[PDB]
From a paper:
UDP-sugars are secreted into the extracellular space to function as the paracrine signals through the G-protein-coupled purinergic receptor, P2Y14, which senses extracellular metabolic stress signals and regulates energy homeostasis. P2Y14 couples to Gi signaling pathways, orchestrating a wide range of biological processes ranging from gastric function to immune responses, renal inflammation, and liver fibrosis. To investigate the molecular activation and Gi coupling mechanisms of P2Y14, we determined the cryo-electron microscopy (cryo-EM) structures of the Gi heterotrimer-coupled P2Y14 in complex with UDPG, UDPGA, and NADH, respectively. Despite variations in agonist structures, the active-state orthosteric pockets in UDPG-, UDPGA-, and NADH-bound P2Y14 complexes share common features, consisting of residues in transmembrane helices TM2–TM7.
Numbering used by the authors:
A (entry chain G): 7 to 62
B (entry chain R): 15 to 311
C (entry chain S): 1 to 120, 135 to 247
D (entry chain B): 4 to 340
E (entry chain A): 3 to 53, 182 to 234, 240 to 354
Write the structure that this text describes.
Amino acid sequence: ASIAQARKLVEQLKMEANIDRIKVSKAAADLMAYCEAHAKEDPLLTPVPASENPFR
Amino acid sequence: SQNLLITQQIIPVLYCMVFIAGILLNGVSGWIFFYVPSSKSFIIYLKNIVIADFVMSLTFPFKILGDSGLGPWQLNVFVCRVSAVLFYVNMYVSIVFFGLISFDRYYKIVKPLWTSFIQSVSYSKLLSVIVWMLMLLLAVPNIILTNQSVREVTQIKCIELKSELGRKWHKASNYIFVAIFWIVFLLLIVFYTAITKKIFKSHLKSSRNSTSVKKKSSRNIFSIVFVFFVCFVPYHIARIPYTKSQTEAHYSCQSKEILRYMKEFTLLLSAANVCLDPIIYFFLCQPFREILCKKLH
Amino acid sequence: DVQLVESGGGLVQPGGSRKLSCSASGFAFSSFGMHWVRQAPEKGLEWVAYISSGSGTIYYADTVKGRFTISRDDPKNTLFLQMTSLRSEDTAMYYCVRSIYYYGSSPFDFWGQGTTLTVSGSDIVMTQATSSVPVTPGESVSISCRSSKSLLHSNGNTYLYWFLQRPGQSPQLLIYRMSNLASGVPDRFSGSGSGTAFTLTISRLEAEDVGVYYCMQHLEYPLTFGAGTKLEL
Amino acid sequence: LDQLRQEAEQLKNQIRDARKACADATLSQITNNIDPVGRIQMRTRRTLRGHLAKIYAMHWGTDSRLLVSASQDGKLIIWDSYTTNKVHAIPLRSSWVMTCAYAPSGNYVACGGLDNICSIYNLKTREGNVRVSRELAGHTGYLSCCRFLDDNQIVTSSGDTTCALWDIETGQQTTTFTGHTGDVMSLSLAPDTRLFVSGACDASAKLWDVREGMCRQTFTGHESDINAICFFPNGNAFATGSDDATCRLFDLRADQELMTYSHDNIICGITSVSFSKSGRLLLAGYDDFNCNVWDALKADRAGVLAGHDNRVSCLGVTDDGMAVATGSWDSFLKIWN
Amino acid sequence: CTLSAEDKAAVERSKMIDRNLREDGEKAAREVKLLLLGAGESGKSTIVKQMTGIVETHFTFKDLHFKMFDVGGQRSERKKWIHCFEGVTAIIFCVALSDYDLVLMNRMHESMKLFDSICNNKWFTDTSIILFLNKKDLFEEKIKKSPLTICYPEYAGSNTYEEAAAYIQCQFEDLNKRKDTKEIYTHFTCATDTKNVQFVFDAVTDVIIKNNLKDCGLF
Ligand SMILES: O=C(O)[C@H]1O[C@H](OP(=O)(O)OP(=O)(O)OC[C@H]2O[C@@H](n3ccc(=O)[nH]c3=O)[C@H](O)[C@@H]2O)[C@H](O)[C@@H](O)[C@@H]1O
């Protein structure tokens, strides 16, 4: 029981180890670019006038 | 005649001393109760008592200045015609709502056999206004019928500022108010005695928690009954002699002055009831205490 | 599944009273509003009365106000219409119509078979340009209608209903709120409108949707129906 | 045994070394050149009243108007958020519900809890009443989260340290996701619904493949139980709220924690977390009865949503980002805009 | 007023739903909620009989409807779902008296630890506990040969059923850190006792009266 669980954990760790990882700087840049691109369409970020606000 | 020591020195200073605390307590209670949910009739009655107490504290300084002597005769006649009437309306609204709280607690704890009435319901909210306007209906004429011009500016008497119909209607409304208070007092005494009897037969004791619960409930009920009695019973046993004194001219000047002083002291006690209420009534309210702790701290 | 069966029709002398009943099955009758709708032998549909779920609100048409009384017994799932002092103009087939109301609901979606009863001004008027349209299967047919007042509301909903009544059958809901296809209706039917003028377009038409098409308004409450556009051939 | 443990330790060390090598910079040191979002002032517009117990879950509809909520009084209420009208009220067989899901099509709703059963109710029944259409059973722990993928499949997380993708028509677990050593407390579905992240009580989140069925990635860093999880709108990142006072943002492609949102004045746990439409604002519900809106790029506390008298249990953002729903233990839902 | 007919009917439907919800809440508020807890085979099954996840037992006694919730078999982190039972009227905790001579860690010590955790947690500060010391008939036979010193070495009393039972009850009651605000209703049951329901009724009646006093602003 313990041996099988340990082998499964080792296999899972090996599978997760060989994945391709990008630099944190590139991921952060992509995240910031998405935020900048979609900021103009975010009602929470920029308050919407009462004309286009369905909760007024 | 007059001694100028009670009605102008002791009464104004005692009213100021009670007012400087009552206005603050009522203001903070009203500020806190704005966020308190009205999920039960008890909370609605507490909010109504808060409103009545706030108006009573607001109308205290008008009297204080009227009987202090510094204010003009116009202020005195305004107090006689408006401020005093509002003060009495608030007092009797508070008394009726104390009776309503006693009945609600009796219904919730004792579980009476006449539970089909269902007074403790949403309709109690309507009952609340049905309370308020009722005393308004008992005091609205007392403001408009005080139209008689003052014969002299040296002194003004409320009886001399009312017409014959107005004087008769006030002599009847003051009696109606006293009768209503006595009915409410008898109901409150009966309901609280029943609640105490239910509590005594509730727990089997022999436990620290049981003893603490019994002691706390008994102390709260005793405090409520004692404060109600002390603040109101002397006033409502002295009001009828005083209104008879100022509606009948055969009671002589000395007894009239003594009754006036007694009425003023008893009304001062009924005024100090506004300060005594928040410690005894509002403080024990669990949502009120929780919101007070959350906000003040 | 859902079934509405009417009873109580027949011959009534003028000035008499008759009690129409509508037994409901296959659905939660208590949670639905119920309408009574008339159809004269050749004059088309006409709304009569309505009772809300729980009998909260009860309404009648001006023609039957003061004479007809609509009620409902939820425990027995029955809809009742008591008619007193029946006139000669009341001779018509009566339908009990199931109609529920919530956001996104499809009211007027089921109609009962109906029973025939034979007796010996400011509301929105719905008009239909064409009464009979000769059509051929496989083509596209556009049925048009107009309203005195715009059916578009401040909430963005345009309360127009397109019903189809086949020969020998009760009216069937096709479109609700001028754009929504009713459940069980094929994608052939499409609703469109500009607020006051509306069209219903049918593509690849077959012989299974031949009948009279009715337009009903639901913006102003006194529900009025169009004259009815009959499809032939 | 010992050799396998040593190999697992070596693999973990290799994973940590790869993560450290890929961590050339930080999101905080990159987003210093962008302006802050300022003080976000979301005022409450709608207050949904009618739940009489603590509200445990709430999910928005894809129309951004219909909103389902679950309360401990055994009630599942579907609200018209625009008019505060109660569209539906579903009595639940088990009143101990901790999760509820609204189908993307809107034809179905889901709930579940201590009964270890995910109940799926049909909202578009011909009879006109909401009836239970399915009762997915097989989880041996309490249902903590559930999320529809379509009208026929749903991913549900349980307290038995496993997740399950079900087939509603058949009622059987299509796929079982195992590997969490603690109770799974939350789920989040990717925009493409091909992957999903589940946070558990082992202070770990796991990125799972829905179709393939194996744990694609594992993310650590939280010091206590992870109670909430939410994908970033881009789908390449997700935020986790834990029993500690920290939210943490992880990147799928970087396989690393990006930023930590925390404050010294905050010491209570985190129950719910969600992103705005653009993902710039991260809304997190806390045990201190308040909600905090953080700048997801700068970790600055942009604003506070206060007005709930008890613990904020559930939080959601509409698909159009128009408003934020917060359901608290005080038995009220508040919509903020 | 500024509403369509369909909007008005939807508002009417919402009002009907509100009325139904208020009626359901009023009906549920009068129900007595009990949370059944125990260290294991402590007699919880017998208590449920005589009175895959959550188990609900509904029974009416003396015009009081009791819902008893058994959380046995959950086998998960209790802290993640115990807060769901914050508002229960009472907690019925069952402890096997004969477990003092058994081990899993001694069974009685584990039961005491679980009782301490349940009583002193942040969610049951004021919730009352009905302690059912079950299997007293077997405990009487066991105490005749097996001394109580196996579980509690500090027990200086004579190895008698009454003295040992009193010592165990006192030890269990000593685990309450909030004795002023919380009451523990210890009861002794052996098998198929009809007085257990009466004891539960009395305890929940006291709890209900205390709750009514607290709600009315009188305590
Ligand atoms: O100058 C003073 O020293 C004071 O004397 C008066 O004393 P009194 O004339 O006895 O007034 P009350 O009879 O106690 O009542 C005052 C007003 O309220 C009305 N009232 C009295 C009693 C009552 O139960 N309800 C009620 O509306 C009266 O008709 C009267 O107009 C009042 O207390 C003050 O208005 C006045 O300022």
